[PDB]
Write a protein that binds this ligand. Structure first.
Ligand SMILES: Nc1nc2c(ncn2[C@@H]2O[C@H](COP(=O)(O)OP(N)(=O)O)[C@@H](O)[C@H]2O)c(=O)[nH]1
Length: 255
């Protein structure tokens, strides 16, 4: 009845959390026509909640079969929640994916894992500035697991209304606004920002997927051409640097 997608960087403790949450209620198979493990399970302590594991990834690029599975599933609306496993010992770099996950429009909850090793992070202030709930967990000591599962189960597409996205530089936002206004009804409302950023990056999968008119296509090219002159960097590099700047600010404001 509530579908939670478990994802995060490799070696963030995702398997460990997944096994604790689901116990031996796990199903193993594969993603259709792709050589990638598919696993899921019911939450041991609440069988109305189901965890869909997703391959560990650093980013949602179009080049990797794992990343495409991650993306295709999150943009398919099967998930009510994303429970983002984050390595607290390497916070900033893990948040690179976190920003992308928020952009899908499926509400994110962060299991701030490996908190035991970390023994400075202000959980309440980190949650405030990222705009997602954050629960310190330890898969080793088995702390915060039930708490984060409970937060995620109550942080869904039907409970969350004001979806707070990472706001970037005015000059990138202008280009995203212009792309959203161009796209209009040609993409889903929930994940509109995800698609706009991807079109701005000239993402092969997204271009091939959307039936965009010549009118739409030409406006998006203009927007991209101009924004590259305003920033003096290529579209991809603009988005990469803006993601890290947003991560660098948020971490400054909360340690
Ligand atoms: N100290 C500590 N180790 C953890 C924690 N979570 C996972 N690990 C350890 O990290 C290593 C990799 O764990 P794993 O679940 O496979 O990470 P992944 N690859 O994201 O599934 C294992 O040795 C596991 O015991 C944690 O919260 N604290």
């Amino acid at each position: 009845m509530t579908e939670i997608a478990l994802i995060g960087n490799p070696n963030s403790g995702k398997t460990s959390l997944f096994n604790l949450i689901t116990g031996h209620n796990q199903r193993v198979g594969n993603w259709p026509g792709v050589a990638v493990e598919r696993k899921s399970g019911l939450v041991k302590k609440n069988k109305d909640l189901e965890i869909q594991d997703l391959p560990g990834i650093y980013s949602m690029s179009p080049y990797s079969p794992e990343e495409k599975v991650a993306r295709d599933y999150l943009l398919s609306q099967r998930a009510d929640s994303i429970l983002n496993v984050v390595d607290a010992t390497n916070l900033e770099r893990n948040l690179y994916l976190t920003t992308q996950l928020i952009e899908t429009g499926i509400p994110v909850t962060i299991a701030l894992n490996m908190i035991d090793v970390l023994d400075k992070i202000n959980v309440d202030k980190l949650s405030y500035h990222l705009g997602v709930p954050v629960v310190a967990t330890s898969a080793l000591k088995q702390t915060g697991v039930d708490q984060v599962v409970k937060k995620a189960a109550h942080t869904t597409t039907s409970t969350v209304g004001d979806l707070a996205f990472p706001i970037y530089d005015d000059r990138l936002e202008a280009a995203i606004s212009q792309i959203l206004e161009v796209l209009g009804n040609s993409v889903p409302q929930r994940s509109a920002r995800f698609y706009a950023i991807k079109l701005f990056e000239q993402d092969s999968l997204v271009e091939a997927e959307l039936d965009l008119s010549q009118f739409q296509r030409k406006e998006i090219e203009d927007i991209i051409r101009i924004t590259e002159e305003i920033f003096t960097e290529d579209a991809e590099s603009i988005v990469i640097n803006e993601r890290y700047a947003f991560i660098e600010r948020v971490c400054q404001m909360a340690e």
